[PDB]
Subunit: 293 residues, 4 copies
Amino acid sequence: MKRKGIILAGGSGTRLHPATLAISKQLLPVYDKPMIYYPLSTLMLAGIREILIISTPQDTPRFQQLLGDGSNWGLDLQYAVQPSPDGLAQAFLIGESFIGNDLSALVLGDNLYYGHDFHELLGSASQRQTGASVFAYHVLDPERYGVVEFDQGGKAISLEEKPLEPKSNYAVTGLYFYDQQVVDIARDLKPSPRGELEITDVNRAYLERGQLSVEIMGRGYAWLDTGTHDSLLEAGQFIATLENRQGLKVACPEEIAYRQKWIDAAQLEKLAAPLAKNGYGQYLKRLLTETVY
Amino acid sequence: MKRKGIILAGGSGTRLHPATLAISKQLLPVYDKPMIYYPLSTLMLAGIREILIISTPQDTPRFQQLLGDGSNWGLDLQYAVQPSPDGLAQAFLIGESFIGNDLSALVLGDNLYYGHDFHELLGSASQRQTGASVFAYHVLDPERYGVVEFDQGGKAISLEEKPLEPKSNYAVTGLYFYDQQVVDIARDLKPSPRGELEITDVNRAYLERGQLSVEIMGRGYAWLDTGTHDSLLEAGQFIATLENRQGLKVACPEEIAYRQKWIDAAQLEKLAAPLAKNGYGQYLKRLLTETVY
Amino acid sequence: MKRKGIILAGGSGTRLHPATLAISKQLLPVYDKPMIYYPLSTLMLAGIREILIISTPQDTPRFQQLLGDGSNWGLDLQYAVQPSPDGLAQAFLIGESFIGNDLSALVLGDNLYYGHDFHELLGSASQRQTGASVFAYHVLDPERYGVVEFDQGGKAISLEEKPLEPKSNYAVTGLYFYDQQVVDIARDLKPSPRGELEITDVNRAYLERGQLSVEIMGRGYAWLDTGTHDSLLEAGQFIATLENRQGLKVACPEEIAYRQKWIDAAQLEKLAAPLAKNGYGQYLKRLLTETVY
Amino acid sequence: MKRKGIILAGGSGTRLHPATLAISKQLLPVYDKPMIYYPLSTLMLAGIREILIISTPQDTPRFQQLLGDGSNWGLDLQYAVQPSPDGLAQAFLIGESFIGNDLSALVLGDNLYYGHDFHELLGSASQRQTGASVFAYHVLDPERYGVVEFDQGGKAISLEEKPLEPKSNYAVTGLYFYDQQVVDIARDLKPSPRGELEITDVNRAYLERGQLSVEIMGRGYAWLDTGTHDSLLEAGQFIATLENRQGLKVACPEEIAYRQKWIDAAQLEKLAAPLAKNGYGQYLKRLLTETVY
Ligand SMILES: Cc1cccc(S(=O)(=O)N(C)c2c(N)n(Cc3ccccc3)c(=O)[nH]c2=O)c1
Ligand SMILES: Cc1cccc(S(=O)(=O)N(C)c2c(N)n(Cc3ccccc3)c(=O)[nH]c2=O)c1
Ligand SMILES: Cc1cccc(S(=O)(=O)N(C)c2c(N)n(Cc3ccccc3)c(=O)[nH]c2=O)c1
Ligand SMILES: Cc1cccc(S(=O)(=O)N(C)c2c(N)n(Cc3ccccc3)c(=O)[nH]c2=O)c1
Ligand SMILES: [Cl-]
Ligand SMILES: [Cl-]
Ligand SMILES: [Cl-]
Ligand SMILES: [Cl-]
């Protein structure tokens, strides 16, 4: 069965004000491209072409101006609004008609991933047609996240949302793969004491039915989020160091679409034209004649 | 005589696309606050309260949403549009009625300044009620700028806009103080070979009449570059290092207004309220009870 | 057959003076640990325990003070001097008696690697008991390196040392695996026009005999070198971002030895003792009770 | 009267191990030059030519190899050892015969200063031929330092070394100017509860006699932190940003000596020769023909 994608690029409330007073966090650049390019590229790398972008009423037209309907990149993008930030699990109610009877994947609009064989890590989660798949990653500050606990055999046995005393240093990352049960689970969720529909409650529902796969995302992968001004800056520096070293870009959607064969050489050449006088368009042009393994 | 301020926050064309596709460069954050806070703070530090913000037609309402009429900060802000990026000198034609018969100051919306006694450096330019004052700063790449040449006595003798063979390494920074002659000079400007109304032509008009003061902005000042992705990132890191070392902010307009006595303690306390859950509001609150020299 | 390691941590001449006037480049820290810890950790990750450190006459005792005989980490370290910087291929002549009749691996003392399944990438090169194995990596500036050219089938067909017009963007990284033929090949090398015994000439000798394996090190790996002051700084920032995100260290030799089972819990506890009041010793202590996948 | 300088470049214990296992912190580079160049340049900027460098027994010959007797730079450098890190005030006992009956200045070997008119700020402290002068700087973490308390009139009224409950956010920086009384005061000091001869006790002695001038080092100056790996890295980035923006170096001793007229053009040209193949020597060469204001 095919899998649809959702990017949640909602309000980060007032947390990063005044930097985010004028625009949405997920429109801020990480080095050389808007933040949302990164999770969008993540969905694309998982082979997902039909994608719903959920944002605030105010910023939706700005996402639309940036991304269009996706057709330029071999995608089909649709848009939905989240009037109020009522929790990550709300994506499934807002996205209910978009999803229909299909499999799905949710990615947070401010999550960046980097590493070798990421494509294959995503592929193996995408091919699991039943149940749910999340990724666990070792962090310094697991108390900020959904935390997964494992028994001595390596099996996930509990999930806790922002525990004061984390059972491990393994956080659940902001990338989630779901079967056709997720909308019904989300519909039956009640708000938590913070007034939010919690994704962790969704994941625990799968866990209790023995249908949650927790794959380790190893330390050789970088999972960056952009939760503070400091971490945003570090994410920019990280991407810049890689791109300036390699002469290759991270999360260039045009490149990914070209490599997935969703667009061809002539379409890529046309996409390069408007940006030909800057490094980004020069990069797209170089992609036409260079072999990159 | 009073001096009015103008902030030119216009289009950077396609140079930083796709990062700047969604929103204007001068609304992007530098570390923890929108870029435009920095030149705005520069004008305020010069004692300027009546300020015209010029931007593109698309982004004007976003500057308006962010900054309002200024009254919350003891300022009087007005707004105007630049339909096409036809040169920095265009600010004086767009801003003609705003300026009237008063003295003026122009700052570029993407210029950041830092250093000791910057207040005094601006004060001494502001008090010159005749002629014009600009600042020259030693840079590695003077070709990118208006370049000033000095004779052996230290007197400015020529200005060249983006010369292929710069006469010195001294660039004219994006901060300009003018008397009542600037509008009339701007009205008589003809477009350059690049189709732009050049500020450098304005400055050369004053130079030929012996009325251009070119002050050296010494190497102990930081005039930070935001022209490239790399330089944007370096500026964010520079500001973060200073703020995290000192526990004091650079270019916090609320603080500057409070210290200029344009707003009082009770007004500052009210401004802190909406942001009380984050570091920026906590900073404003701390300013009410701490003596800072 | 067993494989011995060599780390070349020689003079970088005057290239980074005055920063390197007082000490060797490979003793400078990258974030929180001396540079040489990184390539040392790379050899360890490849399963190599018997390692020759080649440095200048002046700095050998400083490497010795830092690293000792290796016994604290389950290694056996020996030391050799390189009086004059006569080329990377000289490591095999200086290291001839150390190597004996064994397989070998050479790593440059200023090369840093990071990425997922690096262990497995190294393992597959280490298990090739005949011929030579190098890694090719896409860089922005291949003209600074040994460059490998591939035919349409992906087969390596030429190697060029620092070509003005590189045949590809694939540089040979500073990690090299060799069979028992390398010493004899090195002995027959004549100095190049720059007066150096070139590693690229060694690699081309294997290529001509059909015994060079060129494995791609993919873009999901970070290969950093520290060839300039700028790149050194970027390498520090890169490592710090990863370690501060994960609460896990890159190239902690004590950790690697513990995970390879070369030292046990009680030995690791003793190594933690001297450093117990700083973050590094606290990290080693935490490793005793935490499960990390 | 003439004023002699002392640079205290002693042990940082184990705090930054293993990075500092091999070599002293003050020999590590900050961006492009050894750390000690920065405080050395600070003394030079204050017009001080006769300078005692105090370090550990192990690292003294390395400071000597780097700096020599100073004669190449128009300085007269001498050397002395601190066997154990028994407090900053120990500098005056070790340095007693060097100081003699002259005025003095102490700078810590890991303190970096930057800002406009720093020369003048140092000059005005240097010209005070009686009493002592220190500088107070607003910091986020005053507990780490000597902390100065001021009454409502702005007068310094107490000094506390590393108070658990700081009376202000004003730290005393690691630059101190003293009259002929300091040696005798240092001789009468008793160790504190931490077993250290405290500079803060020296400064309090002057305070009680009404002879401590506490000048504010304003927020437009950078007093950069090198106490942690993170802060070391931030300092390197800060210096790189300034130097790469300006094409001018911070704390180039050859430049400062040339500008003070302590060495002439021909001597500077000779100093450039050995480094002519790298940016540092190219910079010195450029200084011979460029006017820099
Ligand atoms: C953030 C992000 C989004 C999408 C992919 C990746 S990645 O797998 O770590 N990575 C560096 C990457 C790639 N590996 N690739 C190559 C690639 C593209 C399509 C399919 C398989 C490989 C790419 O075109 N762009 C990339 O950013 C990172
Ligand atoms: C970019 C910029 C904008 C406004 C001020 C400055 S500044 O003078 O270099 N600077 C660090 C600074 C200050 N010096 N001050 C203190 C100050 C406030 C009002 C008048 C004179 C000084 C402040 O309140 N905010 C500041 O950002 C830099
Ligand atoms: C620079 C470097 C040196 C050695 C390993 C590595 S690495 O494979 O990219 N990496 C992050 C890494 C690890 N993967 N590991 C875990 C590990 C240790 C030993 C065997 C297999 C795995 C580790 O203990 N330290 C590491 O630095 C990087
Ligand atoms: C750390 C430090 C050490 C010495 C000077 C300085 S500085 O005054 O802030 N500074 C940027 C600086 C300078 N201002 N100058 C110019 C200068 C040289 C001699 C006397 C007065 C000024 C210089 O030649 N080198 C410098 O590093 C900072
Ligand atoms: Cl890869
Ligand atoms: Cl200056
Ligand atoms: Cl891994
Ligand atoms: Cl100041």
